[PDB]
Design a binder for this molecule. Structure first.
Ligand SMILES: CO[C@H]1O[C@H](CO)[C@@H](O)[C@H](O)[C@H]1O
Ligand SMILES: CO[C@H]1O[C@H](CO)[C@@H](O)[C@H](O)[C@H]1O
Ligand SMILES: [Ca+2]
Ligand SMILES: [Ca+2]
Ligand SMILES: [Mn+2]
Ligand SMILES: [Mn+2]
Lengths: 241, 241
């Protein structure tokens, strides 16, 4: 299809169009990307992801069209500690994507250790909400919590200082305009605190014509829950000047 | 997802979200449901169907909600014969639906011979555009080309006279309003000729909560092409009093 749209106001237990990978599962109307114990508390060493089953036609060579898309979602992070890790990411990748070996902790379940910073070795675009930046393990991170745009590398091409708020839902709007090629990210807490980051990227040179979209999260030594509460997505192929 | 929509202004041969059954396949940016030879001429004894891969949440028991959906599509039929057969149908059925054995010809690839008219043995809602009505073989049909609403039986719960126009596209809008429980059908030819038929049906008593939507077509001894030219669909779960 030229256009596709779907919306999950909440996540009821009986899902049919979601691909669950790793430790991801539905709990209390929300998707728990990372594993939690019987009490509902976060645990260490866990990676989980979800993808919508239907493939998205991001661009079409024959017609020279590129899709304009928008992904709106909200999530919350909770941890008994104060150094919650490692973060959650909205991502777009080839349809057959699977959790790379050794992609836990700071790699957010998106990159393999040996090629995490090799751009010509990856095919992924992600918007990360990174809460752990210890310079000894996450050497590629700025020294502070941040929202970043990742293009084929765990080392963001652009980041913005961000504030982690335990238990508070962050509302996010990610949009891609094929006309200007700008991928814009706007995130806000209920009190109006806003964060914005954007980057110009030609999706045609990074991803194949058909892709799958979803979320990924992980916790290494440090942990926190990564709760996806809602998600709506829409894409439409358009002709650019 | 509570809501889902997709649009196929045309059908490029590079499809990823369509399930093809039988002889259905993409030809010249359109779906040819029934088999055609090298020159694109229709042949006898062929059945074909397509379904969108993502399952649609028609209704939800736990929340007492039922979906409001709309399906807009256009097709054309062509045959050198004076009695082209057998017809095309938009249908809704359980996710695992496959072409029943012996469902060819007048059964439109939708029903099995043994239970074609047994309502307690089927789970399908379809809007048929039936061009073959020979009273000796299609004993259940009125004696003329017609549009029919089928609920668990090849013997339509309702039909209205329809005119078959060789090689002319028919635009159809099928809608279901959960409030009134009305399934409305409106079809038109490019010259303004209009056909309308409506039927009240509680989809909850006929179909499971999750279903797949698509098209089916067949030709027995008499034949014609059944070309799906475009299709858009949208559904949203709504609270029903
Ligand atoms: C000590 O390092 C480990 O734990 C941290 C914090 O969870 C992760 O960032 C890192 O990738 C993992 O290897
Ligand atoms: C002569 O009968 C055969 O051909 C007609 C026309 O195609 C079909 O309607 C029927 O099901 C099939 O058995
Ligand atoms: Ca990090
Ligand atoms: Ca018939
Ligand atoms: Mn980072
Ligand atoms: Mn009929």
């Amino acid at each position: 299809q030229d256009s596709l749209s779907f919306g999950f106001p909440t996540f009821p237990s009986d899902q049919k169009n979601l691909i669950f990978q790793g430790d991801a599962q539905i709990k209390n109307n929300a998707v728990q990307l990372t594993k939690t114990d019987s009490n509902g508390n976060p645990v260490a060493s866990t990676v989980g992801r979800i993808l919508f089953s239907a493939q998205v036609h991001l661009w079409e060579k024959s017609s020279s069209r590129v899709a304009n898309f928008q992904s709106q979602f909200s999530f919350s992070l909770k941890s008994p500690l104060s150094n919650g890790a490692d973060g959650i990411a909205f991502f777009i990748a080839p349809p057959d994507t699977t959790i790379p070996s050794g992609s836990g902790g700071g790699l957010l379940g998106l990159f393999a250790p040996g090629t995490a910073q090799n751009t010509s070795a990856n095919q992924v675009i992600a918007v990360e909400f990174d809460t752990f930046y210890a310079q000894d393990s996450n050497t590629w991170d700025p020294n502070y919590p941040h929202i970043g745009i990742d293009v084929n590398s765990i080392r963001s091409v652009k980041t913005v200082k961000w504030d982690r708020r335990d238990g508070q839902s962050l509302n996010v709007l990610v949009t891609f305009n094929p006309s200007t090629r700008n991928l814009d990210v706007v995130a806000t807490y209920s009190d109006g605190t806003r964060y914005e980051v954007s980057y110009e990227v030609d999706v045609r040179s990074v991803l194949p014509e058909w892709v799958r979209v979803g979320f990924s999260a992980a916790s290494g030594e440090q942990y926190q829950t990564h709760t996806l509460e809602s998600w709506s997505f829409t894409s439409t192929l358009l002709y650019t000047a």
